[PDB]
Amino acid sequence: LAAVSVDCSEYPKPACTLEYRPLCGSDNKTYGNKCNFCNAVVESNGTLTLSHFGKC
DSSP states (O other): OOOOOOOOTTOOOSOOTTOOOOEEETTSOEESSHHHHHHHHHTTTTOOOEEEESOO
16 A cells, blocks of 8 residues: 555566566556566556555
8 A cells, every 4th residue: 555666667678588576557467577567557658557566
């Protein structure tokens, strides 16, 4: 319960790297890592956002 969100002003990128940082959007959508979650923020106008860092 807070405003902890990642930044994706450099997305989207053609490479996710492959790490594993499951960021759950504020709608409960798990994204493998920051880039996968950041590609949703970029293709969503930022209407996604997250509610908690981790898997939903």
